[PDB]
Point group: C2
Amino acid sequence: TTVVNGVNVDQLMATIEQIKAKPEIAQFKFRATNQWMGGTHNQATIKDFYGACAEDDTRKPMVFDLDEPPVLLGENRGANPVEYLLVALSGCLTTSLVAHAAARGIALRGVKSRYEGDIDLRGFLGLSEEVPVGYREIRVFFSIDADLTDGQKEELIRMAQKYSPVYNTVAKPVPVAVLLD
Amino acid sequence: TVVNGVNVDQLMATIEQIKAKPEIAQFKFRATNQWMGGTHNQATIKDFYGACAEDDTRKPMVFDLDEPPVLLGENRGANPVEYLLVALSGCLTTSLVAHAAARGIALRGVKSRYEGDIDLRGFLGLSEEVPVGYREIRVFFSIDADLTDGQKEELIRMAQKYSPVYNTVAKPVPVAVLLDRG
Ligand code: NA
């Protein structure tokens, strides 16, 4: 009665009450660093973050290699950056779905999902002023194993989207300032 | 003829082929994800489509996503909003380097740092006005090259202009999420 879907709902409840009292606690900052490794290969590191009124440098660094397939001028030294964007979207939607279900006391047995997005490289290459540079659209499907109706499953999915930071960062315009140091 | 480790001959060849046959430039990228309990889930990258053919030749790449303790996880992986920064960082870096290469501009080194801020009240449903996503993301590039600040700033402008992940963040991209019928 303290844990649903492997989420500690007591901790969730305490976090919500803490934020209601002191909204400043809810301000988080996430960070990365990246070093170019030649050609299409580069390496990103995740380490510290800020939140709940303090810097947190407690985690072992998490290192990621990004590259391209040969047709996009790389050697598959890692997944490509637009693939990493789908990874991020998939983790966020899944967590948002599961955590919102947990908060409602809705048990789920299994969750999986699939993702496909369309990109026309004429954008990246500056060959057409029509074509978007980014994803034109992304299509996601979820499968949920639970004692729920299809309508109730669809509701969980709508709530997942509504509360997902990565979903909303994709679907809405978010400003990105890129500067010389 | 290689600049910044980029095969510029292949690049120009690809461009000419696309001008003749624009459909070559249509790619589809994919992922699958399985929930692993709590805030932990796992994404897999394998196949893609592009240049008028399916490519299922790559070995799968698997990524673990989780949360720190204060965000209800157990450090079973970096969190999804961190992976978004990872994506952005790779894309801006490759776009910068590749566009420099196409112009014959050699770079000794490139590095960058990223921060975005988020108010959890969005995710937690505690405010209807608060953005659920990032409020803003800020990126700083350091470029080691035989270039003035203004020349570096031009490479950075072009990086952003032509970066798919930058434009996916900066612009509204439609995303349809549905219950699977297969
Ligand atoms: Na966006």
